[PDB]
Design an enzyme around this catalytic site. Structure first.
Site, PDB file in Angstrom:
ATOM      1  N   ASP A  93       0.886  -1.178   0.000  1.00 21.46           N
ATOM      2  CA  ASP A  93       0.000   0.000   0.000  1.00 21.46           C
ATOM      3  C   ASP A  93       0.917   1.220   0.000  1.00 21.46           C
ATOM      4  OD1 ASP A  93      -1.733  -2.205   0.711  1.00 21.46           O
ATOM      5  OD2 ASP A  93      -2.676  -1.079   2.365  1.00 21.46           O
ATOM      6  N   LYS A 158      -7.282   3.331  -1.905  1.00 24.14           N
ATOM      7  CA  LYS A 158      -7.431   3.245  -0.467  1.00 24.14           C
ATOM      8  C   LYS A 158      -7.607   4.645   0.105  1.00 24.14           C
ATOM      9  CE  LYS A 158      -4.616   1.820   3.546  1.00 24.14           C
ATOM     10  NZ  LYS A 158      -3.795   0.699   4.010  1.00 24.14           N
ATOM     11  N   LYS A 192     -10.398   0.155  -0.634  1.00 23.26           N
ATOM     12  CA  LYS A 192     -10.084  -0.123   0.757  1.00 23.26           C
ATOM     13  C   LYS A 192     -10.407   1.076   1.636  1.00 23.26           C
ATOM     14  CE  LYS A 192      -6.409  -1.451   4.009  1.00 23.26           C
ATOM     15  NZ  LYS A 192      -5.083  -2.064   4.112  1.00 23.26           N
TER      16      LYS A 192
END
Length: 241
Positions: A93, A158, A192
């Site tokens: 990430d 995300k 996410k």
């Protein structure tokens, strides 16, 4: 709520060596395994050993790079990403250079994400891109960061690092998922949520956004994840643990 809570638990990226080991143990819950654990890169080897030893080798290991700052030095972000891969990450990430975007530089975000995606793809590692919706604030900027990330090859977008004052909101989640839908990339790009999901009731609402946009089968572990303080405990409580 029980059904949504079980569903959410199985979509979680759950986030000293003793604490990493405990995290891995906590991911193996009485009602099923979380999708992933999320640790700093240096912790990946001990985490992998622990997950294998407890018989949960299919729990993914996610980590973070360019984190939490989202600086715009591509070479540093790339080195960190390559290191995460070399440590054994399943997923990385990376923080998008959101301050650069807010200063009108779209290209560096594209280039940074692309460089990281190329490294990850070569190693069969998934790349999530943290856009930091709580710092972007504006709908147009959230859309733009999402769009650039997707075009550069993000496998997930995300919301947040969890390290700033404002993390996910339902509105920022909706905006990001609308970009996925509008760009026609729902097969290849997940979403996410980080932060803003304290309770089982919250998780249900965030899942309902996905279900409404894409249909109820979309939000599997390749397309939807959760991370938030307190969420696992709330989910387990809802499920009778």
């Amino acid at each position: 709520l029980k059904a949504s809570s079980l569903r959410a638990l199985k979509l979680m990226d759950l986030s000293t060596d003793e604490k990493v080991i405990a995290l891995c143990h906590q991911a193996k819950t009485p009602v099923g395994n979380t999708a992933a654990i999320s640790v700093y890169p240096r912790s990946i080897p001990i985490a992998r050993k622990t997950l294998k030893e407890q018989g949960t080798p299919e729990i993914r290991i996610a980590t973070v790079t360019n984190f939490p700052h989202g600086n715009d030095d591509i070479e540093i972000a790339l080195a960190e990403t390559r290191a995460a891969i070399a440590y054994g990450a399943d997923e990385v990430d990376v923080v998008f250079p959101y301050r650069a975007l807010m200063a009108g530089n779209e290209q560096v975000g594209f280039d940074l994400v692309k460089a990281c995606k190329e490294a990850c793809a070569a190693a069969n590692v998934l790349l999530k891109v943290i856009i930091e919706t709580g710092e972007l604030k504006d709908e147009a900027l959230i859309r733009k960061a999402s769009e650039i990330s997707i075009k550069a090859g993000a496998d997930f977008i995300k919301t947040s690092t969890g390290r700033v004052a404002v993390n996910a909101t339902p509105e920022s989640a909706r905006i990001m998922m609308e970009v996925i839908r509008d760009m026609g990339v729902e097969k290849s790009v997940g979403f996410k949520v980080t932060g803003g999901v304290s309770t089982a009731e919250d998780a249900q609402k965030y899942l309902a956004i996905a279900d409404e946009l894409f249909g109820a089968d979309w939000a599997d572990a390749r397309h939807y994840r959760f991370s938030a303080s307190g969420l696992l405990a709330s989910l387990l409580k809802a499920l009778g643990h």
